[PDB]
Every structure is written in C-alpha cells, then in structure tokens.
Amino acid sequence: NNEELKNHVYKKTLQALIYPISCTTPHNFEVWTATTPTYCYECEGLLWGIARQGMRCTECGVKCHEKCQDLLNADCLQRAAEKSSKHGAEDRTQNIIMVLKDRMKIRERNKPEIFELIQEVFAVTKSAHTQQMKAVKQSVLDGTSKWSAKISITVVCAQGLQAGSSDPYVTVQVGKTKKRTKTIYGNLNPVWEENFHFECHNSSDRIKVRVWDESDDFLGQTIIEVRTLSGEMDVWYNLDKSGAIRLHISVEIKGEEKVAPYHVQYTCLHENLFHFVTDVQNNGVVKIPDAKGDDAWKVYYDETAQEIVDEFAMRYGVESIYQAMTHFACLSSKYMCPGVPAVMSTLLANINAYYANVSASDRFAASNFGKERFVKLLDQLHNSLRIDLSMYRNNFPASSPERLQDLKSTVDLLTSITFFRMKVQELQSPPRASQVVKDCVKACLNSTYEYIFNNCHELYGREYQPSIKNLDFWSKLITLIVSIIEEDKNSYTPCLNQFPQELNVGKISAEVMWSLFAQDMKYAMEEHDKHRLCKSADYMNLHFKVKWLYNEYVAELPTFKDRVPEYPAWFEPFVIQWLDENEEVSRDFLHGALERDKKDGFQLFSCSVVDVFSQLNQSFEIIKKLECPDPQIVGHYMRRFAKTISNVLLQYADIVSKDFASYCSKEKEKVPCILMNNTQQLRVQLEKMFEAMGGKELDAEASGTLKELQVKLNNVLDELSHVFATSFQPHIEECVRQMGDILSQVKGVAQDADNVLQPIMDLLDSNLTLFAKICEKTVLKRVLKELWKLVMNTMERTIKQCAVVELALDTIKQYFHAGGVGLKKTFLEKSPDLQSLRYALSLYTQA
Ligand SMILES: [Cl-]
Ligand SMILES: [Zn+2]
Ligand SMILES: [Zn+2]
C-alpha cells in the first residue's frame, strides 16, 4: 500500500465527489394501495387492504408507509436506472444517463477547485487526472451493470444492550434472504462469532442487521448500505431504534485488486490532505480554520477541503468521531507549531465528552480508530509535551505574547490528556497534571541555572556592561539569578494560572534557584576559608548581596518561612577576619587621635573621646546593618567585638596613665582635670554603647566582658585621682606647719578658728573653687575623698588650746562638705581618717 492504496483512494474520492449525496433527487410519493401482500422498504411492515395504505414513488416504485417515507436511504435516480437495467426498457435508461451527465457537468462547472485539489493532494498529472476523471464519470453511470459481490459476514459480538437482563439474538437479512444467529441467554455483552454468506448481485439490497431479545422485543438495528463495502471490514455499529454490535465483513466484487476498507482509505485521505495543506501549501504552518463554537471541532478546513473529507465520510459510512480522532492523530504530529495546542485541547475535550449504560472505558473500546492505537498516541503525546515543557523558557520566551499563549494552551492540552485518562481510560493516574508540570518546571530551572553558571561573564557583559582570586563572578551570577526569578514572577506566573494553589511559577523559581545557588555558594566559601586571597571588604559586600537576595526572594517562602536562614554560617569566619582588621585600625586611630589632642593642648570633656567612640560606632554600624538572623552567630560577633572595645578603652586608659605623672606639676591645672573628665566620658558613653548592643539582652560572655571592663575603668580613675592628689603634698605640708606655729601661741575661741585655719583657707577656696568649674561630679568627688584622706594624714604628722583644734576640725569638715555640692556628711563622720585623727587628738586633749 501507500502507492497502490494511495491511488485507489484517489479514484474513490473522485468518484465520491463528482456525484455527491448533497444534490440528490427527492422521491415523489403518492398514496398507494397494495392489491397483494407487500412489505415496507424501511420497517418491512405489511401492506394490504385499504386499512394499510402506503406510499409509492412514481419514479422509483419503492413502497413504504406515510410514517416511513422520510427514513429511506436510496438514491432516486440510481434506483430508477437500476430498475430499468433489471428490465430492459433502455429508452428510459439512456434518458436517465443523460440527466446524470448533466448533473455532473453542473458540479465540475460550479465547483472545479475541488477536483484540482484532489489532483494535487495525491500528486497526479493533469493528463492522467483527466483520464481517470473521465473514467469515474462513467463509473457513476454504471450502478448495476458491473456490480456483484460475495459477502461474508461474521457477527462477532455486541455490547451495552438495553433490557433486568435479556437473551439477545441477531437476524441478518439481505434482500429476501434472512438468517439469524444462536441465542445467548442472560448477557448484555454477548459473543456470537457466527459466520454467514450472502450474494449481493443487486444494489439496493442493503445488509439489515437487527438485534432482538428472545413477538420478540426489539433491541436495535444497523443498516449497512452496499455503497460502503470494501475488502475486509471490522466495524462497530451503534444500534438504531442502546449499545453497539461488532461485525467482521469480507467482500469480493470482481477485479478488486485487494481493496482496503473505507476506514483505512479515509485515514489515507485525511493524512495526505493534512500533509498537503500544512507542509506543501503553508510551508509548515498549520492553518487554523474558523470556529465559534458549539461545532468548532467539527470543522477542519474551509468550504474547499471540508467538503472532500465530509462527502467521502458520508457516502462511505465513516462516523464523525472517526474523523475527529484521525484529525487529532494528525495534529499530534504538529503539536509544537503555534496555535495548535488549543484546538487540540478543545478537540480532545470533545472526543472526551463523546465517550462520557455501559462502562466508559469499554464503550471507548468500541471506537473504530483503534483500541490501543489512540491510547499509545496519547501516551507519546504526553511524554512528548513533558519533554517540551522541561525547556519552557527556551521554547516559550516571554517576548512574544503569542508564544506565551501557546505555552498556556500546551499546559491546557496536557491537563486535557490527563483528564481523558481520568474520565475515559479509567484508572488512578499518579501523574497528576499540576505535579507533572511542576516537575517539568523544576527540570527547566536546573537547566537554566547551569546555563547561566556556564555563561556568567558573557551574559553579564552582554546586558549590564568562579575564581579563588576574585568575587565579581558571584555578584554577576546573583544579578542574573535575580533576572531569572523576576521573569518567572512577572511573565510566566500570570500565564500558567491553571493551578493557582499548587503551581506558583515564581515561588518554584525562587526556591530552586536559591537551593542550587546555595550549595554552590556554600562550597565556594568553604573553599575560600582555607585560602583567603581577597579583601575582607569584598567578602563583606558579598555577604550583603546574598543577604539581600535571601531576604528579597526566599525568606517568605513556606519552605524557608520557618527559621533559621543558613547563609550567615558561610560568612562568619570572613567577618571575624574583618573584625580583626577593624580592631587594628581602631587602635591606630586611637593613637593618632590622642596625638592631635596632646599636640593641640587638650582643649567639659575634650575631643579625643568622642572621636574614639565615633570610630567604634562606625565599626558597630556595619555589624548592625548586617541584620544577621542567626542568633548564635550574631552573638559570636558581639563576643568578638566586646574584646575590641575592651582593648581599645584599656589602651586609652593606659596611655593617659603613662602621661599623667607629668602634667600634674604646678603649671597646667586644667589639663589633668579634663583628662580625668575624658576617662569618665569613656565611663558614660560605654553604657550607651552597652544598651546599643542590646543591654541585658546581650550575650553572657560579652556582657561579662563589658562590665568587667567597667570595673577596670573605675579602678583606673581611682588610681588617677590618687596620683593627682599626691601632686599637692608639699604645699599641704607647708600649710600644716604654718598652722602648727600658731597652734602653740593660743592661750587664755571662736575667732581663733579663723586665725588657725587661714593657712589652709587659701587651698580650700582657691582650689575647690577652680575644680567646681571644670570637673565632672565623679571626678571632683574622687579628688575630694583623696585630698581629704591626705589632709588627715598630714595633720597627724607635723603636730584654750584643745577646743580650737576641734572647732577647726568641724570647719574643715563643712568646707569639704561645701554645703551640698561636695562630699556627704554621712561619709565624713564614719570616715576612717576622721576617727583616726580624733583618736590621735585624745592623747593631748586632757586639759
Ligand atoms: Cl499512508
Ligand atoms: Zn424516488
Ligand atoms: Zn414502514
């Protein structure tokens, strides 16, 4: 076949359209009474007296009821010419022949495009086409002269019969001969497999097949016209009134060079017509015909090829669903082409609705297209569409809206194949539409990621312009990943909205891309940790960029909405390094700042402290803007940074301590004071930073380090105050001997206090007034406790008489109390120095 059959189908199609069934002569029925027992042509009902009057055709001579005249199937002219042939009245035979010629000329004249189309579809020359045409014209004029055929009908089985059971048997009548099969009892899907033979010399002796339930009940019938018989047929017929019946017919006519059934011929015609209008004419594009709407899928071409397939199918008994199911199997070969997925989805939806009182899968087993054929086809098409979607971004760019439509409609066709499996083939299908599409999108994402990971620089440099010596590659890669996820979020998600609660293209994109990029980045940083050939600033910016990505696209995904992020672990060592370098820079800035402050003259606090804390706060700003979500790691950062702060401020304290015993001389009296003020300033702003780092929320180790540091600082300030008080010891000794000389003069009370205190009064007013101006609270009080200590120490080393010293003692007590600005009396009274001096006085205070 394919060469012999192709030609046979060519001939039969020509003959099928040169005289179409659309322009057929209508019978002319007049009331008729049968004088002898006749039987109706359709229902075979009896015709007799005036009580059973029928109708008669004045040209055919066919006999039927009034209620049956419309249900006939037999060309009027062909029947007439056949009758004249049975007889011999040749005059009318030729007359009718002439009228047939005329009605074929009419057709060739009116619609000549059809026959040239047939010519080109089968690639037949003009000459041979005219000869073969000329031949079929005459074959139409011979509907009896050269027709006879031995028929062999094997009744195989039936299905879905209407009864709660039945005992069906089949009767097969040709012309006068009538036979029947065995009876199967209690079976609505029986099997006969009975063979019969028939002679069909006539032409209007149709093969009547009727199924009865064992007068008997009527279960259905199929009438097989003679025009629809070739070679060896195996056909399911729907019973007319209910189920179907399967017949295996074989025909022999005369010279039938092994003709093939008209189903096979039809698939040939449809395949070649498709392969013509698609490839040869449109060069490849599958022209999509009109639609709208209830009978859209019922149309395949325009009024120029639709006529060919339809007239071929009607005049040879090919059912509509066979047409549709062959056309689908043709489109399947052109599913990739634009606009086809849609019509294939609708077409399959109708093939699906046509098959959904017998099961659905078994009913579908009755389709003559092919039990396994159609399901194998559908399987190949499904397994093909998933391959086509596994590269959807490449095969369906977001650019062309039409291509995006072909994507949406491809997913629709896939859902329709599955739906066909769930409502027709009948079975549980683990391949669920949404989940299969999901799998395909995942595969496409993997391919895409590997593609941008193999062409990072090329693509980046093409649009926005891995190494151990450089990190630019990762910045570019992140940028391109953002591009991909943004395209999946902007274009492909609105298009693939077939499954809103199970397929959010954007979120799958985000998740997959992040996972791949995450294991890649992780490995890369684990590699960089051993080597470390780049700047800490670079690792920092990369930490910042990965952060931005995760927070922008992944953090809010259900899979990663549940804490904790994993990426900050990749970077912890590098930021540790950055903290070391930062520490070193901060020390060098401390030294450099204290040189400007010394060289300037130390102009209530100076500028070096706010400079140091400005530096440290610049450093801390970076750690705070990292917004690290892993609590243990951020706690690690604070743990490491507390050490930085501690060593910095201790460095300050040690430097000033080195230069303290040098500015205390009787020269600069503002400088030491403002230095101690600076230490105190460290003491106050440290706490501000302590709460800036969390406060009590801070880690245990770090918090411990900072408070221990606080202790240390306080101790430093104490030591400093001590050293500063020692600066005045000689002057105080002078005052104590100067008052010691007047101490002996007094002899026989209130005025004497002033005369004895005058030497130290200069110190009291002159110094406690100067410190009151440029000293901090804590600073001043420290100096006061120390100075007091040293006063009591000195007045116990050099030295009416008795009362004077005690009253003066109270006077000094009040002067150091300074009313309410200096020390508190509660301390002065229970002071260890005061009671020591009083105890010393008790030895002489006897008179
Ligand atoms: Cl073929
Ligand atoms: Zn008629
Ligand atoms: Zn009738």
Author numbering: 541 to 703, 708 to 758, 774 to 800, 808 to 922, 929 to 1037, 1053 to 1190, 1197 to 1341, 1353 to 1403, ...
What did the paper state?
Munc13–1 acts as a master regulator of neurotransmitter release, playing a crucial role in release itself and multiple functions in integrating the effects of diverse signals that alter release probability during presynaptic plasticity. Thus, neurotransmitter release is completely abrogated in the absence of Munc13s. This phenotype most likely arises because Munc13s play key roles in docking and priming that are associated at least in part to their activity in opening syntaxin-1 and thus stimulating SNARE complex formation through their MUN domain. However, the C1-C2B region and the C-terminal C2C domain are also critical for release, which may arise because these domains help bridge the vesicle and plasma membranes.
